[PDB]
Amino acid sequence: GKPVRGQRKGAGSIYITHGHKRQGQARLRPLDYGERKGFIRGVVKEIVHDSGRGAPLAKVQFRHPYKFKKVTHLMVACEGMYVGQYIYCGKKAQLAIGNVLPLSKMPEGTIVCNLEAKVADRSRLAKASGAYAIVISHNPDTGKSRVKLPSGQKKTVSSQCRAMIGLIAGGGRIEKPVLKAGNNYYRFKVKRNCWPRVRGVAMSPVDHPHGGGNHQHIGFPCTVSRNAPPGQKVGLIAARRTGRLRGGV
RNA sequence: ACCAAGGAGUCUAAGGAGCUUGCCAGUCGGAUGGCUUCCAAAACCUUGAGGCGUGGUGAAGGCAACUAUCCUUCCAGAUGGGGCUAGUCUCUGCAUGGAACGACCGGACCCGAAGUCCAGUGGACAGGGUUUCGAGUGCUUGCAAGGUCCUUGGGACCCGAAAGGUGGUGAACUAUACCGUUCUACGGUGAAGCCAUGGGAAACUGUGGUGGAAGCCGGUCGCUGUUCUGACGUGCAAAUUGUGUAGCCUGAGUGC
RNA sequence: UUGAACAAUGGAUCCUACGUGGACCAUGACUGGUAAGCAGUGCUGGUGAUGCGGGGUGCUCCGAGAGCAGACUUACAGAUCCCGAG
RNA sequence: GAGCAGAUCUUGGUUGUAGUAGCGAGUACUCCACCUGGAGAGGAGUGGCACCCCGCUGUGUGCGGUUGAGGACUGGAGUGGAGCAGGUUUCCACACCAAACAGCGUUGAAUGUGGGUCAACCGACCGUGAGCCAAGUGGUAAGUUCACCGAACAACCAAAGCUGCCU
RNA sequence: GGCAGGAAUGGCAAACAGGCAAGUGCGAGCAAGAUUCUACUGUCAUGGGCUGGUCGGUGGCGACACCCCCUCCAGGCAUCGAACCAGUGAAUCCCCUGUGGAGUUCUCGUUUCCUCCUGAUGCAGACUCACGCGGGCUAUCGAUCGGCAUGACAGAUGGUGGUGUAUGCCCUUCGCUCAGCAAGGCGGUGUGGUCUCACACCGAUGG
RNA sequence: AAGUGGCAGUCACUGGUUCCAAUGAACAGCCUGAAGGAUUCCCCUUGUGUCCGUACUGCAUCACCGCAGCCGGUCUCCUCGACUAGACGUCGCUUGUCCACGGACGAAAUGCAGCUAAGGGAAGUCGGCAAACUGGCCGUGCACCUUUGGAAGAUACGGUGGCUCCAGAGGCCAUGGCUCGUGUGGAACUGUUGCUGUGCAGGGGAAUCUGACUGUUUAAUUGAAACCCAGCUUUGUGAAGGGACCAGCUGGCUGGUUCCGUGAGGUGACUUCUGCCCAGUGCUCUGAUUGUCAAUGCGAAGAGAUUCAGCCAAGCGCGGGUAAACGGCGGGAGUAACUAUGACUCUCUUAAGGUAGCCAAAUGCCUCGUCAACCAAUUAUUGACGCGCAUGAAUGGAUCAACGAGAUUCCUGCUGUCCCUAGUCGCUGUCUGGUGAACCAACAACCAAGGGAACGGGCUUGGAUGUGUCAGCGGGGA
RNA sequence: GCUUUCCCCGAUUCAUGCACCAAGUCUGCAGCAGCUGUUGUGGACGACUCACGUGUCACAGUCCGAUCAGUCUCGAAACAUCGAUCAGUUGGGGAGUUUGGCUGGGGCGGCACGCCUUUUACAACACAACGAAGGCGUCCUGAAGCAUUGCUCAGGCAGAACAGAAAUCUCCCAGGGAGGAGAAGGCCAAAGGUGCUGCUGAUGCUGCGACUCUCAGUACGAGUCCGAAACGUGCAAUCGUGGCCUAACGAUCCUUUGGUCAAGUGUGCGAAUUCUGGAUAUCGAAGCCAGAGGUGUCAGAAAAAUUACCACAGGGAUAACUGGCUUGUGGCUGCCAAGCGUUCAAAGCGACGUCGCUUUUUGAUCCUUCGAUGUCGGCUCUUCCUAGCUUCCCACCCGCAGCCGAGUGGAAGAGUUGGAUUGUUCACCCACCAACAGGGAACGUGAGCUGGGUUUAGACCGUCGUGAGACAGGUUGGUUUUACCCUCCUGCCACAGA
RNA sequence: GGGCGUGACAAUGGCAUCACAUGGUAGUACGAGAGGAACCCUUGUGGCACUCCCCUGGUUUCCACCGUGAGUCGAGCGACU
């Protein structure tokens, strides 16, 4: 009868992010002449806590490309980065923690974060707490590069994508068990309206394909198709397998 | 409960079967046209196409009701005529009902297509037979108006659904998100950290304090609403109430 | 002897507007059932639609059928009194 | 649009019930005095008395308001003092309660009349927040409570109309 | 009009957030408004008119202190959660001594009750070693000297400079003294006519 | 010269300290600095301050909403004295008020409230429902079990007044003056043994089922074992992506995001485990090389409409994986040197044949199952046993500390729940002055029997019956 | 020690500092002092370039030489993306609708829904019930049809080598006891049987008749009777258009086939449906006629569940509660007398049989009630019955010595209890007692109470279902309102006037 | 003959004394024994009924007297909430 929770969320009325008191986008300084040809220096002016995020951010101040000015960019912090650090951004930057340099000046063992997925893009990969990617290999024939992502996947991105050298700060936070419901309450109160989460077997058949019945159960296989309409796409979406994972994944 | 007033088979298109009236192989013709202070948008007039009827039958191609003195036949039968007689004979034969047709019109069969003929591309009919059909004909039973009882579509005798649809309104209660902001006595208890100190070879450890954590406890405001299955239950109240009893009360708390 | 009796204001030909289409009761004619104020049937009559006299009372029994009155007489059935009639 | 006894019929007016059930949370009143047409109470109370006067007799535990004297309640998380939303003259005074209302009525938020609300300093106004509108552009058969609000963050975008000197 | 600058449309939206500046007599006098009127005493923002010689100057070792417009950039204030502990100040409240008035007094009670007050504002003052309330910084000295010390309820510090010392320097909450200001207020005691009301006098500016 | 009488709560500021997988706005406005540039030399609508709100009410017992002048609801601020831990509770100054329809009569019965009650003590009842017991503080002290935190205020024992003393802590001025523990311990005396003397103020213990907890919940019959939680585990996703809104959009959302992130499910703390089945359905992967398979396209024949063939997609078949996907997880007959039982064997058969565990459990029909405990008596309850109609493993199975207005059982104490009721009291009612409805109403209003739409007030046959009150009453008026 | 060859490179990395609006070089113009100094203001390089030189950095411009250029940046790229139009797939995410009927309530069950036979069924015809027993949706072509024709069947006595009970053969007997496909009934003997043989009459040319059963005197279906073409069989009469007879089946619309048409023959003639402005075309389509493809719910819609979240219109035409009829069942008594009883049928029983009564269990029914009669138990309170438990007649009788008792009669006055488990009625124990009898009163009694149970909405388990959901399976939690009217009853009072 | 009052009478209706037990009878009758009554007479008891308050209880707004707590009236006294 009635639509589903994950179908009313995408409508985005009271499921908008609680971002009012956040810091903005955390991205690498954009690509300009300095960052392409040589290197540019920036002072890590502050490390700050961003709401709804696990990693600390860093206000890093560079000079303006063509104006008498100081552009204060904001990027996810590298673990070990301190205030007043002098990070370096560009092609001729050195292989030091916090530096931002193209994915081609990096040897084939480098541990990187804030990784770009496209050229002139600004840091769309490996951005959560304790996240890091590992530069696997380079290909000069294409100017591209295989990198190992935190997910364990291996993505090929151009060797003009810029990363940041090191880990993302604030690591180890899933290694603490949330002990109370109130901890997760405060956790999600600054992210978005998604907690607590009623389970579909506890609803009525008007509200969810799982609701109703005299015993709380799903009467049909949970593994739903990928071509399933929005509204019966609840359960395990296009699951290749189910059950306990043992041996290889 | 009582009385008063209102209150339910109506109008319309088409039609059926009676009845009335007028005309008649016709009838009607108020679409429209001619006229003449209000009456008069009336009345009157036949310019009237046309409607219905005069022919039916076949899917159609199409075809289309014999009869030269008069008259289809038979049974019953209304009148009437001429003889005759209280015995009682002939002729007439309406209407109606039944039967028939050697009749005929159209359709369908069978054997044939012989025969006659010509507005002559070989065409038109024609003959004899049938367990044949027609909402057929056999001296056209029509038209129009009114009226009665009805039928069907319409609100359809009157009242009566739960429903379905189209467009709007509401977040003052209430649910939730965000922005700003408010509120949270008094105690109990005693986490980390810290101080002194006893023991020990050391690793470690005993004791007395300090400290003031916790979705900790009692408990006030407050919020909620267990129990009496209390009150009330024509209430204070369309959900409240007790000189009760309870739950929580630093939090996932609370309100604006 | 016009060839059985009795009866008979009747036979033929039509048209047409409605209501009804829950039935029930009674009887060796019965069927199912232990049976039922049960269920289902048959003939006929009743009730429904029907009042009146009697059965105290009773939709169905017995008598009889219903315009308004007068007189007489009766049906069923009645006469200790209630209550007409020993 | 033509006849009512009914349709839990419609509208109106009524009746019994019945002077009945009731008008029982928030502890509470009392005395004197004044205000009255009357309120320590009478219809010509009664005998003389021929209205005065002198006798006798009756009076409901007794309307309202306000001083004063007592008795009590609120008991600062108030029955106090201020303001929000809402109210919108209810504020104040006088007249007035024999029109009605206040489940009494010399009183009131009643009725009638007439008054009263003064800001450079208290606030709206100034912006900004969540959010919204126009604009720009787009979508629709078409208006729209059609889409975007994007100086963290948009576009398909010629939005700097302002400043210094000279003039 | 020329030159030189100048990405990024205009608004709305909070009577709780941001946001210039007022207090007392709560009265002269109101029946009813009052940080609005009134008497005093102030505060704020902003406009106009007038009157061969130019980087304001100086003091301090320092922390710092004093007197005499324009453009652009870098910062900061505005500016931000909650709870708990300690301190200081305010008003409230209470106590002691004394005064002025009142209540009780059958007996006792030098008793009982009220009052004895002080606002904004000031380019006023003394401290600020807060010698009342505490942080920061300065200079000198150079520690744990062999038992490290200082300061806190608890923290907390210290060769990245402790303790000690000093013209020490700064900011801030206050508090105190003065002006406001006693003339006002509060508790009273009287005079004068009376009136459609002014004068007189007294009573802690206590600890 | 120029803090300071006291100390309690509130407020302000100051110095800090803790909490966060939570870090707790923006703008206008204002200021400072850095670097440049440039540099003629008192008076005025008591200047301007314009515009709008400004009464009163406002947790209201009458100003708002609730039909109203409704015991309901409704935002914030200030907040005294005494007892006390106190913003509890009780009383009082300041402020405000005596207004709620009243009066008589000791005031029936019944009722709603407050209390008591001998002897017994749950025998009452579905059930200790309701009430009672206990209650503050100080000292001594405290068991099982445990997740080592708790349980715990366990359970329990003693004391508590009044007065007179004895000790006992600090500060200022200068070891004396003054202030100086309402904050503690001891003792003597004292009293009809009684003192948290009033208001206030836990009864306790022992188990089973269940949910871990805390939180949430059907406003107005269900507060729960339901939902949520943490934890666990699957799942899709590396962005031209996952999910997903919209009529549409070069549209908005998650996303100010980027795997320690996340969109979609399930289970439900810790602990100990989570067994077998991929045959069915589902999902997913392949080459989907063999089968089926659309539209368009290409070819042929036809005069043409049209007809016919072959090839090219996904899908479906085919093949593989997957159960913390949905789910599922067996019969028959013999057999041991007393009997009995059946370790053992035979056979059919499944995708697998229910594994470890647990049970007459909130799941067991039979069933009040059998044995034991409890009791005088036990359809209750507990411990066991187990062919379990129909238990069972994240449809989670089994233990389980702590917690619970959860469901059940036992013990103690306490009791009017009961034997078996009685008394007393306020407000009712009762009488009354003022005011004054509604429900309901065919008409009526005494029965028995009969018959009858089978249970009459009316009918028939009988029996009663004078009319009219007042307070009650629950048999009837189906 | 140069040259060239092109590849690589192009000033910033101890430090929370600063950094822009040009300095230098060269040079123009204007003013003043005289190519110079000064003042003022420009320009180029600094800071490479995007056919030539001249032209002002710009373009033009005239000549010269000769075959224009223009992308913000990176990637991808004629693929892909967002949509567009079709097509395949998927699609309870969503919508619309349906989810038969009968029925001793409905559901489950079944078919009494279209048919045939026997019976009910009651001697014309007719005759219902979820009455009784069955059958039907088929089967059969040198047949299981038609015809001629010959023969006689079931069974039995007797007989014949193997051979017997039962092989085959022979004789006699045999009314049908066989066969005719099947259910039952009827029918039939030189045969509506059967062998052999011959055949196809298994649609009597049509748009072809009258009828009968059914019945409305409709259809379909089935069947009877005819007319005449052409045939089979037979000497012939005849018989034969299916099955010996009674069952064996199907509308409109649509499709399909055959016919019509068209063609062909026609040894000369014809002999004809339409596609509409006139014609053609074995193009296509339409038409008429006869079949066939099926509606079994069989006079013929195209069709799944659930609701305890529920609703509406009704219904006492119809269930659940009371009551009514009946009492199978239950309960209570009778009669007889086989036996038991030491002998003895009755002191006490009473088998096999059999007559009754009650409502008091459960049935059966469906009569009243569905515009509602509050649905169990308990408590309270009253009354009634007797089918008599105690007490009384110290009754009578005994297998009665006493005691304890058994049975029977009169008698319904009084009594008939306290508890544990269970919601319980009941049951079962513990006791007390003279005894702890059985019942009724709308299964008395909810405006008397309670609310434990049944019986809403919440929730859990088990089994069932794919599911929502179901469950006489279990569990927990869950608002019981109103009297003041009339009467009865309780007390109270007056008037008695009518 | 009426009015008021008293004293009675009594139509009709209701109706209320049921049961048990100690002791004696009696260790008797009866009975081989074992065992083992009864009438009746006392005295009690139970259920029910009716009445009542001397005694003993229960109740206490006799707020009668007294103790005692918080607050308040200045304390006493006496009070009050």
Of A119, A101, A100, the closest CA to residue A157 belongs to A119
Model resolution, angstroms: 3.2
Distances (CA, A) of A197 to A8, A12, A53, A200: 14, 17, 21, 9
Calculate the CA A188 to chain-centre distance.
Answer: 16
Distance CA A96, CA A235 (A): 46
Residues in chain A: 249
Residue owning tokens 């220096």: A41
Nucleotide with C1' nearest the A19 CA: F256
Distance CA A100, CA A47 (A): 17
Q: How far is the CA of A97 from the C1' of F360 (A)?
A: 71
Distance CA A247, CA A204 (A): 39
Q: Read off the tokens for A154.
A: 């291996």
Nucleotide with C1' nearest the A74 CA: D152
The residue type found at A228 is: A
Q: Read off the tokens for A129.
A: 């707490």
- Produce one character per residue of A8-41: b if its CB has 16 or more CB atoms within 10 Å, e if not: eeeeeeeeeeeeeeeeeebbbbebbebbeeebbe
Of A204, A199, A194, A189, the closest CA to residue A222 belongs to A199
Distance CA A152, CA A72 (A): 33
Of A155, A125, A151, A161, the closest CA to residue A137 belongs to A155
> Residue A248's CB: how many other CB atoms inside 10 A?
4
> Residue A148's CB: how many other CB atoms inside 10 A?
16
Distance CA A99, CA A187 (A): 31
Distance CA A43, CA A88 (A): 9
Distance CA A97, CA A163 (A): 11
Residue owning tokens 């009313």: A8
3-state secondary structure A98-118: CCEEECCCCCCCCEEECECCC
The bases of strand D with some atom under 7 A from any protein CB are 129-131, 152-153
Q: Read off the tokens for A184.
A: 């997760």
Helices (H), A48-156: none
How far the first Cα of chain A sits from its last, in Å, is: 38
Of A26, A18, A31, A29, the closest CA to residue A128 belongs to A26
Distances (CA, A) of A26 to A96, A99, A141, A179: 20, 16, 32, 30
Distance CA A85, CA A60 (A): 9
> Residue A162's CB: how many other CB atoms inside 10 A?
29
Q: How far is the CA of A237 from the C1' of F282 (A)?
A: 12
The residue type found at A6 is: G
Specify the DSSP element, H or E, that contains A158: strand A154-158
Distance CA A71, CA A63 (A): 6
- Produce one character per residue of A120-146: b if its CB has 16 or more CB atoms within 10 Å, e if not: ebbbebbbebbbbbbbeebeeeeebbe
Cis peptide preceding A196, ω within 30 of 0: yes
Distance CA A54, CA A45 (A): 20
Distance CA A61, CA A69 (A): 10
Q: CA gyration radius for chain A?
A: 22
Q: How far is the CA of A52 from the C1' of F46 (A)?
A: 62
